[PDB]
Design a protein around this ligand. Sequence first.
Ligand code: CLA
Ligand code: CLA
Ligand code: PL9
Ligand code: SQD
Ligand code: HEC
Ligand code: BCR
Ligand code: OEY
Ligand code: CL
Ligand code: CL
Ligand code: FE2
Lengths: 170, 244, 334, 30, 101, 32, 33, 97, 137, 200
Amino acid sequence: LFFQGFHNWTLNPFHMMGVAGVLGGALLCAIHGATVENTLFQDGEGASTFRAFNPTQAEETYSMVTANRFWSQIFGIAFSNKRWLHFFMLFVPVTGLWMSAIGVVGLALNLRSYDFISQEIRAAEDPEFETFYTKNLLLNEGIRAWMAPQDQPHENFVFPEEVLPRGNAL
Amino acid sequence: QTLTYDDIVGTGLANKCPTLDDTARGAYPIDSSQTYRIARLCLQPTTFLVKEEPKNKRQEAEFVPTKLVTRETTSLDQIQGELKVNSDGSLTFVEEDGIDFQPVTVQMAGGERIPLLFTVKNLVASTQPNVTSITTSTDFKGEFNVPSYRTANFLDPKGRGLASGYDSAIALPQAKEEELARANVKRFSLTKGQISLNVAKVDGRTGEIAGTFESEQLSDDDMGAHEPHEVKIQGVFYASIEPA
Amino acid sequence: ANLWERFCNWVTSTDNRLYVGWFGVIMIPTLLAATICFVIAFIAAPPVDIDGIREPVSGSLLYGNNIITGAVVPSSNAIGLHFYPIWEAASLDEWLYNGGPYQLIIFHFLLGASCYMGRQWELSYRLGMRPWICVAYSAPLASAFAVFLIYPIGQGSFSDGMPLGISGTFNFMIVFQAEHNILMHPFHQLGVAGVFGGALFCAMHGSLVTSSLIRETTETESANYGYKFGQEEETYNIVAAHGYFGRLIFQYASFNNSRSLHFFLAAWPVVGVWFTALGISTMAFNLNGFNFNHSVIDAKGNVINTWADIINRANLGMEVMHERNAHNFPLDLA
Amino acid sequence: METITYVFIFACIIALFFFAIFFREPPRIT
Amino acid sequence: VRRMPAFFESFPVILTDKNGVVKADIPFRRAESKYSFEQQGVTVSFYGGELNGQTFTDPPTVKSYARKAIFGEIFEFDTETLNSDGIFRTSPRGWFTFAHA
Amino acid sequence: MEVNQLGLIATALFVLVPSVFLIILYVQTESQ
Amino acid sequence: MEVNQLGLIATALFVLVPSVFLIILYVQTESQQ
Amino acid sequence: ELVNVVDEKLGTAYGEKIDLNNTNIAAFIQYRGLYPTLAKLIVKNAPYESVEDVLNIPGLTERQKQILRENLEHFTVTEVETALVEGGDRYNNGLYK
Amino acid sequence: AELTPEVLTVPLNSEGKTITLTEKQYLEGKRLFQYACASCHVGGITKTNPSLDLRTETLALATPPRDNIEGLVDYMKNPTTYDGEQEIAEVHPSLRSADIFPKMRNLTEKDLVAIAGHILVEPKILGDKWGGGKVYY
Amino acid sequence: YSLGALSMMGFIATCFVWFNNTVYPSEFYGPTGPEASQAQAMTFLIRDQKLGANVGSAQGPTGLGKYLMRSPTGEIIFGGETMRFWDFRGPWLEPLRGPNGLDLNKIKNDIQPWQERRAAEYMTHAPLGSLNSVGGVATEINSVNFVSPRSWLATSHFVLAFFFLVGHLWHAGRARAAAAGFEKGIDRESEPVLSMPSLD
Ligand code: CLA
Ligand code: CLA
Ligand SMILES: CC(C)=CCC/C(C)=C/CC/C(C)=C/CC/C(C)=C/CC/C(C)=C/CC/C(C)=C/CC/C(C)=C/CC/C(C)=C/CC/C(C)=C/CC1=CC(=O)C(C)=C(C)C1=O
Ligand SMILES: CCCCCCCCCCCCCCCC(=O)OC[C@H](CO[C@@H]1O[C@H](CS(=O)(=O)O)[C@@H](O)[C@H](O)[C@H]1O)OC(=O)CCCCCCCCCCCCCCC
Ligand code: HEC
Ligand SMILES: CC1=C(/C=C/C(C)=C/C=C/C(C)=C/C=C/C=C(C)/C=C/C=C(C)/C=C/C2=C(C)CCCC2(C)C)C(C)(C)CCC1
Ligand code: OEY
Ligand SMILES: [Cl-]
Ligand SMILES: [Cl-]
Ligand SMILES: [Fe+2]
C-alpha cells in the first residue's frame, strides 16, 4: 500500500509486465498440468491413472498429437514442440520477475511512472474532465496523508484534522 | 382512482403530475376574507430548450430542442405554500417547501451535455389584479431562485472545491497559477428565474387546477468555471387549493 | 440424411478448423456482441455517470484517454441491479450516459465464457480425451463471475463491478482493500500462494525439463529441433531431472511419476484461484478480512500499534477519499 | 494522432491473430 | 513552513512555531478549521533577493508563497521559453544512477 | 490532449525497426 | 525555426519504408544462391 | 477579482464566534444549554441584523432569554453567505466525525 | 504505564466528591458498555448522531452535567437531550425504557455505575482517540 | 445431475437469505444489506428534520437531494448512495410510502418512535464485519463482536454452491467419458485423432 500511495506502482509498465509474467506463469502451470492429465494414454487398467507410469519407460505418457489438435480447435493455435513448450514455461515467469526488478530500481530513486502530464494539464484546466486515472490519484493522496504520521514517526508529521483530505461525509 | 405504490412502481407514472378531466372548466371562487394555500403543486417538464451560442458574427440565437438523458427524474412535486389575496385583488403564491428542484442533464446536437437545476425555489407568483375566481384564463407569473447546481462541499476531479478541497492544482506544483485561477477558485452562483403558469382546467368543486407552464433559467456554470446557457423549460402543472 | 442431421453433423464436426459444437452456438454470437460493443465503446463512448451523481467519468480514447486510463465504465448507481437493455432506454444517448454498454458487454461475456468452458468439455468428448480441462478453466471463469456479477449482487449495484479498463481495475482493487481489507483475508492469501506458486512451479518444471533435454542437435541449431511432433519417444530424461532435483532438496521432495507431477501443476494454481474467487464472492457479502485494529494494548490500556494498524491508516485514506462526492451520511454501508 | 496510433497498433494485432491461426505452419507428424 | 519530504508528490502547507507547534495551515475542510491564515493573520515578509523589504498581508498572496515555501527557497522562473509544465524532473545525477544500476 | 509529439515517432520506430528485422530474417529463411 | 512538426515523421517513413522493402528483397535473393 | 468566499469568511468574526446567520447548527453544542432546542430556534429565525435581536425570538422562555444573554459574547452576525446556507447546510454540512 | 487507582478515580458527583474503582469494576464496565452501548458508541462517538460524543468535556457541558457517575447513572435511567429540555427514553436505551430496549432489562444498579466509570476512565487512558473518531484510529 | 441441482439451489438460497426479509425475518436474522443502508438514510433524515431541516428541498452537493431524490422511474426514494437500494421493502418503512414513493407529508408528520428505533437498530447492525467477528466496516476498531447471520449464511452457501457446480462438471464429464470408455485414457492402438484429417 505504501508503494501504491507514494509511487503509484500499479501504473508502472515494469510492474505491469511482471504481473503478466506471474499470472501468465500460473496460467501456463495450470493449463499444461491439465492438458497432460487429460490426454494421457491408457497404460494401465485401473481408474487411478497415476499407477500407469514408469519413470524408466521410453514412451510419452500423454498424447502431444491429440493435445495439439484440441487446442488448435479450441483456441486457434497450440504447441507442437515439447522443448519449446517447456522452455516457454521457464522464460515467462523468469522474465516477468526480471522486469519487475527493473522498475523497483527506478523507484529506489523515486523515478516513478506516477502521472500522465497530458491528463493533468487538461484536468487542471477543465474541472469536468475525470478519468479512472485522476480518481486513483485522489486515493493515493488519501493514503499518503492518513498513513504518513504513524508510518514515518521519525518525521513528527502533525496533520490537524482540517488539513486531512476527505470527501463528503466520510 | 385510488392507485397504490405497487400499481405505479417502475412504470414511470411516479414522475407524472395528476390531471383533470376534459370537463373541468369551472372556477374556484376566492373569498377575500379567507386565507388559502396550495396543498400540492406538481410541475412536470415535457420539453427542454437551450439557447445556442450565436457565433461572433451573430444575427440571432435560437432556442434549440434537446434530448433528455437522466430519465424520469425531472418533476417537481409536493410543493406547498400560502395563496395570499392581495388588496388590488390579485393572488400571490409564496412557496414554503416541497420537492422543488431536480438536476437534469439534456444533450444538444453535437453531443454537448447541459446540466441544470430545474427549480422554483422561493417561487413567488402573482395573478393580475382584481381576481375574484380562478378560471381557465387565469395566469400566474413568478420568479424563483436558482442556486448553484453543485453546492459548496462539491469536489472536482482534482480535489478542488469551495467549502472543502484543494485550493490549487497540486499536480502542477510549479505552474503559473494565474492561468488556472478560474478553475482553482470555486464560485457559488445564485441567479433568478421566471415562470408563467397558465391555468386551463379547474374543478371548482375540489379546488384542483391544472395547466401548462413555461420557465426560463440558467444552466450549470460548474462553480464559475464556464459560462452557463439559457434554458427554456415547458410542461404541465397540477395544484390543489385548500382553504387555510 | 435430412437437413437437421447434416446441420448437427457440421456443428459437431471434429474437422472444422475451429470447433463449433452446441456450446459454440451460444458462445459465438455472445462473444461477438460483447467484443464489437467493447471495441467501439472503448474508442468512442462518451462519459458515463457511474456513481449516479451526475458526475460522468470519461473512459474512451476519443474523450481524452490513453490505453492505460481508458475503460468501459460500469453502469450508473441510480440503476443499481436493474436490467438496462438498449430497448429500456428512451434513446441511445440516454443509454450511453447511464453506462448501458457495460451491462451489454459483461452479460454477453459471462454467457460466452461460460459456454467456452462447456465447449472445452464438448470437444474433449468428441476427441476421446479425458474431460477435466474445463475444470481447470473454471478457476479463471469463477474469478470473472466474482468481479463482474457476484460482487455487484452483494453490494447492490453494477456500478461497483469491475470497470473494463487497465486503470479501472486498479480503482476497483484499492476501493476493495479499503472496504474489505482483502490483504488480510486468507482466501486472497491463498490466491497469492496460488499464483506465486504457479509461477514458481511453472519456472521449475520448465527449467527442469529443459535441463535434461537429450542431446539430439548440434551447437549451431536450436535445441528445439531435437523434438519432432508426434514422436513416439520422450526428449528429456525424467530420471535425470529427479536425480538433479532430488539432490537439490532431498530424494522424496521430488516427483518421479510424470502423472503425479503434472497433476500437481494443475491442482496448485487452480485450487488457489478457486479460493481467491471465493474470497471476492464472500467479501461480496461483507464477510471481510481479519480485523486486528487496536488488538494490542498495554497494562494501562494505551493502544500499542502493530503493522495491522498501519495498514488500517492506509485503508482509511482510501475510505475517505473514494467517490468523494457520493456519500451524504457517515457510514459507507455498501 | 494518439488515438489513431493506439487503434492502429490494436488493429495490427488483430490481423496478426488471423494469420497466426489460419496461416500457421501446419503441425505435421514427421 | 514544514518542508516537502522527497517521498511526496504533494504536501499540505503546515506552519509551526520555533518549537514545532502547529500554528497555521491551509485547511482542506473549512467548516471546522481553527488554523487558517485568515484566522491567524499570517503575513509574509521577504529579506534579500528580488522582494527584499516587501511584506504582503492579503491572505491569498501569503498562501501562494506558503505553497512554494514547502519546496524551500523561492525563485522566479521563466516558464515561457521552454513551455515548461510545472512538474519536477530529475537531474543527470538521477538519470546516470538509474541507467547504471 | 497536450501530448508529447515526439511520442509518435518514438512509437512508430519502436514498432517498425524490430518488426522489419524479423520480417527480413523470416523471408530469407523461406527462400533457401 | 517554426517548422512543420510532422516533417520529421514524414521524412523518416519516406526513407525507411522504401529502403526496408529493398533490403528485404536483396537479402532473400542472396539466400537463394 | 476572484476569491473563495468561504476562506474570506474565516477572516471575519465567523472565524472566531458562532455566526447566528451562517454557522452550522452543530457549533451550538460548544456552550451549555443551547443544543438542540434554542439552536433550532436561532437557526429557524436566522437572519438577524444584530446579535441582540436573538433575544426577541417569539416565545423564548425566561430561562432561555437568560441562557442567550449568558452567551451573547459567543455570538456574532455577519452578512448571510449563500454558499454556507444553501443546500440546508446549516442543518447538515457533510461533516460528521 | 499501568492501571492505577489514580487513573481509576473519577467524579462521583458535581460536588467534586469522587470515588475510586477497582480494576475489576472498570473491566466490568467495559464488558457491559460493549454489551449494551458500543453498537452505537464504539470508541466514544455516537454513530446515530456524530455531533454528540462521550468526551468528558462534552458530558461536562451537558444539562444536567454528566461528567460524573451519578449524572451518568441518571442518564441511563432517564435520558434527556443535551440541554435537558426533553426526555428521550422512547428512542434511547434506559431503565425507564427496558421494555423496548430489552438489553437494559437485567442491568443492576452496580452494572450502570461500572458503565459510567468505564466511560469516565477511558478518555484518561486513550485521550483524543476517545470520542475522536476515525482521524485517531 | 444432483450436484447440478444442489448447486443451483445453494446459489438461490444465498440470494434468498441476502435479500428476502419475509421468510428470513430481520427480527431474527438482522437487517438485509439494502435494509441497513436504507435505515441509515432514514435515521439522518429524522435527526436533521427534528433540528428544523426541510428534507424535501435540501439540495445535496451533487445537486441531487440530500435525503430524497427520484429513482429512474420517478419514485421518491432515499438519497445518497442508498439510491441503489430503493427496491427495499420492509414493514418499518412501508407506512411512509405513498403512491409516488415516499410521501413527504407522512415524513413530516407520521414517523413514530418505533420506526426511529428500528431504523437506528438496523443501521447499526448492518451485515458488515470481519472474519474474526469485528463488526462494522473494515476500518473499524475492535469493540463490537458481531457478524450478521445473513453474511454467515450467504457466504457459506455461495462457497458450497460453487464447489458443487465443480463437482457437477467433474462427475458429469467423467460419467460421459466412462460411458464411452475412455475415462482411463486414450487407446494408443486406435487413437481417435490419428484417424482424422489434418486441420491444415
Ligand atoms: C504482490 C501483490 C499481489 C499479488 C501477487 C496478488 C495476486 C492476486 N490478486 Mg490481489 N491485491 C493486492 C496485491 C496482490 N494481489 C493489493 C495490494 C490489493 C489492494 C489494493 C489487492 C486487491 C485485490 C482485489 C480486489 C482482487 C485481487 C485479485 C488477485 C488475483 C488476481 C489474478 C486473478 O484473479 O486471476 C483469476 C483469473 C482471471 C480474473 C481471468 C479470467 C479470464 C476470463 C475468463 C477470460 C478473458 C478473456 C480475454 C478477455 C480475451 C483474451 C483473448 C486474447 C487471446 C485475444 C491474484 C490471486 C482478484 C481476485 O481474487 O479475483 C478473483 C481481485 O478481485 N487483489
Ligand atoms: C456443513 C454442511 C451444511 C450445513 C451445516 C448446512 C446448514 C444449513 N443449510 Mg445448507 N447446504 C449444504 C450444506 C450444509 N448446510 C450444501 C452442500 C448445499 C448445496 C449447495 C446446501 C444448500 C442449502 C439450501 C439450498 C438451503 C440450506 C439452508 C441451510 C440452513 C437450514 C437447513 C434446513 O432447515 O433444512 C431443511 C430441512 C430438511 C429438508 C429436512 C426435512 C425437514 C422437514 C420438511 C421439515 C418440516 C417442518 C414443518 C413445519 C413441521 C410441521 C409438523 C407439524 C407441526 C405439522 C442450515 C443452517 C437453508 C438456508 O438457511 O439458506 C440460507 C436453505 O434454504 N442449505
Ligand atoms: C484499443 C482498444 C480498443 C483496445 C482495448 C485495449 C485493451 C485494454 C488492451 C490493452 C492490452 C495491453 C496493454 C496489454 C498489456 C499486456 C502486457 C502488460 C504485456 C506483457 C509484456 C511482457 C513482454 C511481459 C514479460 C513477461 C512475459 C514474457 C509474459 C508472457 C505471458 C504469456 C504470453 C503467457 C502465455 C499465455 C497463454 C494464453 C498461453 C497459451 C498456451 C497454450 C496454447 C497452451 C495449450 C497447450 C498446452 C499443452 O500442455 C500442450 C501439450 C499443448 C500441445 C498445448 O497446445
Ligand atoms: C485429524 C485432523 C483432521 C485430518 C484431516 C485430513 C485432511 C487431509 C486430506 C487428504 C487429501 C488426500 C490427498 C489428496 C488426493 C491425492 O492423494 O491425490 C492423488 C495423487 C496420487 O499420488 C500418487 O500416488 C500414486 C499411488 S495412488 O495413485 O494413490 O494409488 C503414485 O503412483 C504416485 O507416485 C503418487 O505421487 O497425488 C499426487 O499426485 C501427489 C501430489 C498431491 C497433491 C495434493 C493434492 C492437491 C493439492 C491441492 C492443494 C492446493 C493448495 C492451494 C495453493 C494456494
Ligand atoms: C443507538 C441506538 C444507541 C445506543 C445502543 C446507546 N446510545 Fe447513547 N446516545 C445515542 C444517541 C442517538 C444519543 C444522542 C441523544 C440526543 O441528545 O439526541 C446518545 C447520547 C448519549 C449520552 C449523552 C452524551 C452527551 O454528550 O451528552 C450518553 C451519556 C449516552 N448516550 C450513553 C449511552 C450508554 C451508557 C449506552 C449503553 C447502555 C448507550 N448510550 C447506548 C445512541 C445510542
Ligand atoms: C447463425 C449461426 C452461427 C453464426 C452466428 C453469428 C456469426 C453471429 C454473429 C453475431 C454478431 C456479429 C453480433 C454482433 C453484435 C453487435 C452488437 C450488439 C453491438 C452493439 C454496439 C453498440 C450498441 C454500440 C453503440 C455505440 C457505442 C458503444 C459508442 C459510440 C456510439 C454507438 C451508438 C455506436 C453459428 C456459426 C454460431 C452456428 C449457428 C448458426
Ligand atoms: O466502495 Mn464505498 O461502498 Ca462500494 O459504494 Mn459505498 O462507496 Mn460506492 O460506488 Mn462504488 O464504492
Ligand atoms: Cl473512487
Ligand atoms: Cl450516503
Ligand atoms: Fe511437462
